[PDB]
Design a protein around this ligand. Structure first.
Ligand SMILES: *[C@@H]1O[C@H](CO)[C@@H](O)[C@H](O)[C@H]1NC(C)=O
Lengths: 30, 73, 113
């Protein structure tokens, strides 16, 4: 079978605290 | 043998990626109700393991003793 | 470099080598394609005991994505709060004032940016 993966599979890119921001990152993502 | 490590419904999500001889594993847990289909939603995954084993990984097989889904990054 | 030991382009560390001709093997010369960095594979040609052999140790440093474990002798001091000081936290150096904070850290994070 085949399904869809909607808005699924996001992980934390690095071990750095961030808050109240928008962050653009380039990596292997689903 | 080279590397050894021993340490001491549901929906379990994992991300495996290999680079520079390091295997990165990311794990998250979410409680759901239906088994047949992947539910829609947003869930973030925290780091667990960074394993220093320098091999090419091109295939994998799941080990069983009730469904699992595979997607590619 | 291609078939036995490939170093990444972004390498941060040190390379140490020395000569052991007083103390006194196999390497790989045929393979399908180059290696990716920090990879091993276990078409083998033996060395002849062309020049005297050398021993190599390569140190690679992991840059503080986890709590710090390996570092040198420096003596810790008492922290001074609400006062303009020079500070050194785990090799992170600055000049400023330090106050208690209401921010909450998840356990894998050590500093905020
Ligand atoms: C891993 O092995 C496969 C076949 O065994 C090979 O084609 C591939 O190039 C290898 N990966 C490397 C060298 O990064």
């Amino acid at each position: 079978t085949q399904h869809t993966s909607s808005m699924r599979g996001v992980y934390y890119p690095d071990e750095i605290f961030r808050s109240d921001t928008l962050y653009l990152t380039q990596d292997l993502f689903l | 043998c080279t590397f050894e490590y021993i340490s001491d419904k549901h929906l379990r999500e994992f991300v495996f990626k290999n680079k520079d001889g390091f295997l990165y594993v990311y794990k998250g847990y979410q409680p759901i109700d239906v088994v047949r289909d992947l539910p829609s939603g947003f869930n973030t995954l925290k780091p667990i393991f960074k394993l220093p084993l320098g091999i090419n990984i091109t295939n994998f097989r799941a080990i069983l003793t009730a469904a699992y889904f595979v997607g590619y990054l | 470099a291609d078939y036995n030991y490939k170093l990444p382009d972004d390498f941060m560390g040190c390379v140490l080598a020395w000569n052991t001709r007083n103390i006194d093997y196999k390497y790989r010369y045929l393979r399908h394609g180059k290696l990716r960095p920090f990879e091993r594979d276990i078409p083998l040609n033996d060395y002849g005991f062309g020049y005297q052999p050398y021993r190599v140790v390569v140190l690679s440093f992991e840059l503080l994505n986890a709590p710090a474990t390996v570092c040198g002798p420096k003596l810790s001091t008492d922290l001074i709060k609400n006062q303009c000081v020079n500070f050194n936290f785990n090799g992170l150096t600055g000049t400023g004032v330090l106050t208690p904070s209401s921010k909450r850290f998840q356990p894998f994070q050590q500093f905020g940016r």
